[PDB]
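Input for the complex:
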Amino acid sequence: NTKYNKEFLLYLAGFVDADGSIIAQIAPNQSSKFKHRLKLTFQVTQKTQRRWFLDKLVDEIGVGYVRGSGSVSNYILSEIKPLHNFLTQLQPFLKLKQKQANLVLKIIEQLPSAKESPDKFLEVCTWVDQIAALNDSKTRKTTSETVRAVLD
Amino acid sequence: NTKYNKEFLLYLAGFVDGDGSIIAQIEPNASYKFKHRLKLTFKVTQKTQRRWFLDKLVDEIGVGYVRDEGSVSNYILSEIKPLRNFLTQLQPFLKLKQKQANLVLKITEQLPSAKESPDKFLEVCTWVDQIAALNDSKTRKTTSETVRAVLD
DNA sequence: TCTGCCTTTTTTGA
DNA sequence: TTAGGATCCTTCAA
DNA sequence: AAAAGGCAGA
DNA sequence: AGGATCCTAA
Ligand SMILES: [Mg+2]
Ligand SMILES: [Mg+2]
Ligand SMILES: [Mg+2]
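Predicted:
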C-alpha cells in the first residue's frame, strides 16, 4: 500500500471536493448472482487543455488512468484495493465529499459478505443510494428498490 | 496581517483551483479619469444548498461575503488590501491559478501609479488581458485595446 | 460469475 | 471621481 | 460532475 | 466560472 504525503493529500482533498466525483452505481446484469453488480469510481474531471494536471495526478497516485472525452478529460480510479487505500488516506481531509468516501470504504469492506446473501447485498445497495443522495445526482436509474423488486 | 494556517491554505488552494475564479476586469465608465476602471475579484462558486461552506469561508478568511444568485451562491472578496494579503498567502499553494494570483498582486502594487499616466494605465490593462487569457474566458468584451481608443 | 475498462449521455454547477 | 457593492448574463467544464 | 450501457478476460 | 453593467456615498 502506497503511503501518500500529507500536503499532497490536503491540496488534493480541496481539488476533489471541487472538481472530483465519488460515484457509486448499481448496474443490472443477468450473469451476476443477484442480477446486479456494483461499481465504485473515483473521478476527477478537467478541460482537456489541462490534461497535463491529470497526467501528473496519475504519477502521484501511482495507479488509475486518464481518458479524453473530447473537450474534457477525466482521471479515473476503479481498481478496488488501490481505491480503498487511496480513499482511506484522503478521507480525513475531505469536507464536502467525506461522507461519500467513507460510504465507499464501508461498501468495499463489506463486498465479500454482500456476494453471499441477498439481504446483505440489498443493504450494501442502500449505501449506494446514500452516496447518490449526497452527490448532485440527476440521471440515476437503478436503485436499491430496483434490486429489491427483483425479489422473486 | 491575518496569518492563515498552512493546512487551511493547502486545502483551499486545491478547492480554488477547482471551483474558484481570479477575475480581472476593465469597466468602461465615463465618470472615471481614463473613462475606465479596473475591478479585481476573487470568487468561489457553489450550489446554494452548500452555501454554508461559503459562509464558513467568510469566517476563515475573515473578510468577504456571500451572495446568493438563485441556484448558486458565491463567496466574493474585492477589498483591495485584504485581497492582496490573502492572495499573497494562498499563491504558493496554487497549481492552476498561480499565475493569475501573481498578476493580480502585480496589478495591485501598481494601482497607485496606474492613474499617473495614460501609458501606465494601458500597461496595467495588458496585465488584465493576461489574466483573462489564463482563465477560460468566453464572454470578455473590454480589453486593453478597447482602452487604447483613449487616443480619443 | 465477477471486475475493470470502454463508450456515451444528461444536466447542471460552476 | 472613486471603491466597493449590486444585479444580470453567457457558456461551458464539470 | 454524475450517471447510463456494454465488452471481455480472468 | 468568468465575465458585463448599474448604484451610490464619501
Ligand atoms: Mg464543484
Ligand atoms: Mg474547475
Ligand atoms: Mg468545478
